[PDB]
Amino acid sequence: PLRLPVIDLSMKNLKPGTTSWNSVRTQVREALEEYGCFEAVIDAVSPELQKAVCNKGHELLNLPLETKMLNGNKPEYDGFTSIPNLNEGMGVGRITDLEKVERFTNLMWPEGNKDFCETVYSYGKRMAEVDHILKMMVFESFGMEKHFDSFCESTNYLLHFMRYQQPGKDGRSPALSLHKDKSILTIVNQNDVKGLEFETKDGEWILPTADNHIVLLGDCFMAWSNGRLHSPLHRVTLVANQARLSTSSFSFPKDIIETPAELVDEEHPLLFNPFEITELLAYCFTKEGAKAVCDLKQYKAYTGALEHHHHHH
Ligand SMILES: COc1cc(C[C@@H]2C(=O)OC[C@H]2Cc2ccc3c(c2)OCO3)cc(OC)c1OC
Ligand SMILES: [Fe+3]
């Protein structure tokens, strides 16, 4: 039975310059190159905070439709969506900006909801720190430390909840459509109900248990790496008659993704011209842009150049 790599991201391993930092960095790079994702042991968020954030996700999604629609009409980022009798979700945009989180909380609860605001802000800050460390290891593995600070300037962080109602049957119940994330990195907590399912480069499907967190690569990091890393296709398939709520943390660039020239060579011609993230995400949620959801090569930034394995030699 296939399984994603399992990487120990406990804070005791994340001290830069140490032996454990180097061994984790090697495993992160290998996993994101081959699988594009891995199971992660993450202790930056206590179990108590993880369940509290889960409760806040339910509290938010329990709100009336018209209240949740106040968060805007951008489902590609934080806007509310739902499919009848199937799923629903929305996001808290810019979760690391306390002023925006306060504003969001008072928009949903005009009387105030201090417990909601403090909980989701504390969680978004802690997961952003894990995201920052993972990006730092990836940059080190490519020898691009000199570009790291500029790449992380004004990083946009998103906290997103998706809830899936009880499928009413055992066995496999498709619950979320196949896609690639357009993030830099995505960190997922399945809140003890599995369903997130990945395809491998070889066409095999891997459905992890809910034991650990899941870290996966988005198309922004893939494009930055000039295709040297893999952004994996993934979907949600319920495999039990029980409801599910996912807690996901996305990182996005300030605006523009550009492949460093150092990652372009003869065997790795430039795959993607620069592109802006908000434009790409909006396109993917249109009828005409559906083809880019599962393949960034369908987006206008694609150059038509051959992938590395197709280099003629
Ligand atoms: C790019 O193509 C897609 C990307 C996402 C993930 C989004 C992303 O990449 O950035 C933040 C995420 C926001 C989001 C998360 C879960 C969602 C959702 C939107 O809509 C309903 O479920 C979900 C898709 O559809 C399931 C999709 O295909 C249309
Ligand atoms: Fe996803």
Curated annotation (Swiss-Prot):
PROSITE patterns for the chain: FE2OG_OXY
Q: Which reaction does it catalyse?
A: (-)-yatein + 2-oxoglutarate + O2 = (-)-deoxypodophyllotoxin + succinate + CO2 + H2O
Q: Which positions in this protein are listed as binding 2-oxoglutarate?
A: 244
Residues forming the Fe2OG dioxygenase domain are 154-253
Query: Which tissue types show expression of this protein?
Result: Mostly expressed in leaves and stems.
- Signal sequence extent: none
Please state which protein family the record places this protein in. Answer: Belongs to the iron/ascorbate-dependent oxidoreductase family.
Q: Write out the GO biological process terms.
A: phenylpropanoid biosynthetic process; response to wounding
Q: Which UniProt keywords apply?
A: Dioxygenase, Iron, Metal-binding, Oxidoreductase
Induction / repression: Transiently induced after wounding.
Query: Which GO MF terms does the UniProt record name?
Result: 2-oxoglutarate-dependent dioxygenase activity; metal ion binding
Q: What organism does this protein naturally occur in? A: Sinopodophyllum hexandrum (Himalayan may apple)
Q: What is this protein called?
A: Deoxypodophyllotoxin synthase
